[PDB]
Amino acid sequence: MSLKVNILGHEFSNPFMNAAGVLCTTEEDLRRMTESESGSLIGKSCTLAPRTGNPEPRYFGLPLGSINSMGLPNLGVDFYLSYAAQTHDYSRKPLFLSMSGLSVEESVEMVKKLVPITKEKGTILELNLSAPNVPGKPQVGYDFDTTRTYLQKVSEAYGLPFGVKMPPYFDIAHFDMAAAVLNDFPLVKFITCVNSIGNGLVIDPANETVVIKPKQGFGGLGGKYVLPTALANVNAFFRRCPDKLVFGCGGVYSGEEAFLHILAGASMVQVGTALHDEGPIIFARLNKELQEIMTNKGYKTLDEFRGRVKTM
Amino acid sequence: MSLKVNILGHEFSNPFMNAAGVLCTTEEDLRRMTESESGSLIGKSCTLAPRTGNPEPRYFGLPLGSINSMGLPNLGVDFYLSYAAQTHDYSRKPLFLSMSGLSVEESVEMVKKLVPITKEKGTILELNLSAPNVPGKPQVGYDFDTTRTYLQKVSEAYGLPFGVKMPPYFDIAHFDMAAAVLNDFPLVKFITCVNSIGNGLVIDPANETVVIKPKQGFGGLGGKYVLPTALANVNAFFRRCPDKLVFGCGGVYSGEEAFLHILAGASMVQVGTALHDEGPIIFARLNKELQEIMTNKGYKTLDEFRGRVKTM
Ligand SMILES: Cc1cc2c(cc1C)N(C[C@H](O)[C@H](O)[C@H](O)COP(=O)(O)O)c1[nH]c(=O)[nH]c(=O)c1N2
Ligand SMILES: Cc1cc2c(cc1C)N(C[C@H](O)[C@H](O)[C@H](O)COP(=O)(O)O)c1[nH]c(=O)[nH]c(=O)c1N2
Ligand SMILES: O=S([O-])[O-]
Ligand SMILES: O=S([O-])[O-]
């Protein structure tokens, strides 16, 4: 039996990795992800210059998941590039970097710097089009003209296969419009579905006060809240973008949710809130739990069921 | 303490009503809602002609809520108008009707018929701009140009105060754009936030099959999934549309969630999934639970705390 995944030129030991933003900001974070049983890892969504992010408190664990407004705290693109070029052990697993410049001009500068490192080391780009916690910056993925500009300019500047992290969509017309843009860019080889459900609000009834400080308490939702939305997006793009891969992100706490993502079409499965809760030991648990499910169903590889969700 | 709400010159006994679509399609449904302890009730979102709706199965209760793709099954506008004009006991409580024409033309034809009944009986209109389960019909509320057209034509045709049922937004810019449209229409006196989180997907791991038949398993989510989104939408429009009321809908299972909606800015509080689960006896429970919280906090009226959520 095998959890192996063959995509983007690499053999991943298993389909699991961190969600961008969780256990991937510092060198120590990235070391712990590399030493984990995860099939891969992705660096914190970075900007050209360092950021310290939003004021505290900016993260609140919930019974059904999490709410956060981190604000893209990151050590700056030069740090992650240096990690990718010099520090990361590629013999253990492949590396993704998430880039989340706050303008197309910023993104172009950043991805240009990555080109030589991709060529030398094989580092993979995930362009973030869904940063919901940066004050005054709308989510790029909800504006299809802006999205087109970003994809055009990054395609020109980077010129190598890359992927995108998308915000969740909730309307069939939006799935259609998003896919129409994505399908115009052959260098976009994977779509990660989904980023946090943006701009939720949690209030503590006892003190009648919001639970996070930034943006009047408005923050991105993760965890159990997002699983159905995540599965829908994965499946919608799996079907609409047949010449691209889809990665699943949202609501994964166990092998069961991982199984559902893969059934829906996911090549790789990203873990955010649950990883934040449990630490990198979760990857060992997820591998065991997914294998358990496969044993019970008589599957020997992921290829036996990936994208084979049945409809009525 | 007092649970009363006083709006459009009507006294409501308490802020609770059904969410459109739940316990409100047939005469019997509406009877049970009228005989309940609810402060009000709303008719099923109707169309000019009757509809039988989407194929089965089209509803599935979930641990954390519900997924559905009902497809606007309704007895047609004439049925609901006749109910409003002849059958409903207004001495018990005020009545809302939800109207959900599939085109602006259809919507206009329907609201023209309501005019004399509103004048005679006080029946209140909620115009539905978020029907996520009609195959081939995008949610109007996610197209601000289309939304503007609907509000213009309905404002002109109806010429009386009315409300709108909005889809959930997940981006600050969308809150801004939605409010900009709504604020151009003075006859829009209330905004109901929110309809289902559209186009989620639930898969059964045992048979690897989606749980509802329509639209390859894609359906609207309600229940515990939607509470943070609902509260965010309520509060965003509470602040952005001071000339209007906001009604809360989403994730209400208890007096505690009701309290949070009102704290966020809600005038009326609608109950969907929980009512579907428990039946109209829920309204007796909700009144008691809200009364308990207000007593504990020393709030004599809802007006003492409506929209008074604290930020950091
Ligand atoms: C603390 C923290 C920080 C971030 C995030 C989340 C959390 C919890 N998320 C969103 C994340 O990648 C993921 O899409 C969501 O959390 C949904 O997955 P889960 O349901 O949490 O597994 C996120 N996404 C991204 O693309 N770049 C980032 O820098 C961050 N930052
Ligand atoms: C079976 C069923 C049927 C419908 C709905 C829901 C459900 C469960 N909903 C959405 C509903 O009004 C409400 O906005 C959501 O269910 C969110 O509230 P809850 O979290 O379920 O309380 C709905 N909304 C609407 O405006 N008109 C309708 O006809 C329907 N139909
Ligand atoms: O870092 S996240 O908050 O965009
Ligand atoms: O009736 S609901 O499915 O729009």
Write out the two tokens for A158.
Answer: 């980077």
Atom of ligand 4 at shortest distance to CA of B74? Answer: 1
**B142 and A171: CB-CB below 8 Å?**
yes
SS3 of residue A49 by DSSP? coil
Residue type, B72: L
This PDB structure is determined at a resolution in Å of 1.8
The Cα–Cα gap between B262 and A201 comes to 13
The one-letter amino acid code at A61 reads G
Q: Identify whether the C-beta of residue A43 lies closer than 8 Å to the C-beta of residue A95.
A: yes
B44 neighbors B64 (Cβ within 8 angstroms): no
The CB of A252 under 6 Å from ligand 1? The reply is: yes
- Whether residues A199 and B169 touch (CB distance < 8 A) is answered with yes
Residues 6+ apart with CB under 8 A from B90: B121, B122
Number of domains observed in the structure of chain B: 1
Give the H/E segment covering residue B42. strand B41-46
Indicate if ligand 1 lies below 6 Å from the C-beta of A39: no
Q: Is A55 helix (H, G, I), strand (E, B) or coil?
A: coil
Closest-CA distance of chain A to residue B266, Å:
14
Task: Give the residue among A167, A175, A194, A303 at the shortest CA–CA distance from A239.
Answer: A175
Q: In whole angstroms, what is the distance from residue B249 CA to residue B112 CA? A: 27
Distance between CA atoms of residues A63 and A126, nearest Å: 30
Q: State whether A311 and B209 contact (CB < 8 Å).
A: yes
CB contact under 8 A, B171 and A198: yes
What are the φ and ψ backbone dihedral angles of A23, each rounded to 5 degrees? 50, 50
Cα–chain center distance at A91: 22
Asked if residues B72 and B47 have their Cβ atoms less than 8 Å apart, the reply is yes
CA A301 to chain centre: 23
Residue B92 resides in a domain? yes
First-last CA distance in chain A: 30
Q: Kindly determine whether residue B172 and residue A200, on different chains, have CB atoms separated by under 8 Å.
A: no
Q: Provide the 8-state DSSP code for A53.
A: -
Has residue A229 been placed in a domain?
yes
Report residue B112 as tokens. Answer: 């023209």
Q: What is the distance between the alpha carbons of residues B309 and A209, in angstroms, rounded to a whole number?
A: 6
Nearest ligand by distance to the CA of A46 = 1
- Closest CA of chain B from A119, distance in Å: 36
Helices then strands (H, E): number in chain B? 9, 16
> What CA–CA distance (Å, rounded) separates A94 from B83?
65
Interface test with B, best of A64, A147, A172, A262 (most B CBs within 10 A): A172
DSSP B220-248: EEEEGGGHHHHHHHHHHHHHH-TTSEEEE
Which among A46, A14, A6 is positioned nearest to A245, based on CA atoms? Answer: A6
Contact B92, B39 (CB under 8 A): no
- Name residues contacting ligand 2 (CB within 6 A): B 19-22, 44-45, 59, 66, 68, 70, 98, 128, 165, 195-196, 222-223, 226, 249-252, 271-274, 276
Q: Give the strand pairing for B203-204 and B209-210.
A: antiparallel
Q: Which of A132, A210, A309 sits opposite B203 (nearest CB)?
A: A309
Q: Is the peptide bond before A246 cis (omega within 30 degrees of 0)?
A: no
Type of residue found at A51: R
Residue A312 forms part of a structural domain:
no
CATH number of residue B130's parent domain: 3.20.20.70
Residue-number span of the structural domain to which A20 is assigned: 5-53+72-197+223-304
Q: Which atom of ligand 1 is nearest to the CA of A72?
A: 29
Q: Give the list of residues 6+ apart from residue B212 with CB closer than 8 angstroms, or none.
A: A312, B57, B58, B59, B60, B67, B68, B69, B202, B219
User: With an 8 Å Cβ cutoff, are A224 and B64 in contact?
Assistant: yes
Q: Are strands B162-166 and B124-128 parallel, antiparallel or unpaired?
A: parallel
Q: Is residue B244 part of a domain?
A: yes
Any domain includes A153: yes
Count of residues in chain B: 312
Q: CB of A237 within 8 A of CB of A183?
A: no
CB contact under 8 A, A235 and B201: yes
Pick A67's closest partner by Cβ from B228, B236, B293: B228
The approach used to solve this structure was X-ray
On whether the CB atoms of residues A228 and A253 are closer than 8 A, the answer is no
Please name the residue that has the structure tokens 């509406």: B30
Which residue in chain B is spatially nearest to A206 when comparing CA positions?
A: B297
Largest Cα–Cα distance in chain A? Answer: 55
How far does residue A187's CA lie from ligand 4's centre (Å)? 39
CA-nearest of B256, B258, B259, B266 to B235 is B266
Contact A7, A61 (CB under 8 A): no
Closest B-chain CA to A220? B170
- B67 lies in some domain: no
Instruction: Judge whether B101 lies within some domain.
Output: yes
Residue B137, judged by CB atoms within 10 A of its CB (0-12, 13-18, 19+), counts as middle
Residue A58 lies in a domain: no
Residue in the structure block whose two tokens are 């050209």: A48
Amino acid at A159: G
Within 8 A of A174 by CB-CB distance, chain B residues are 142
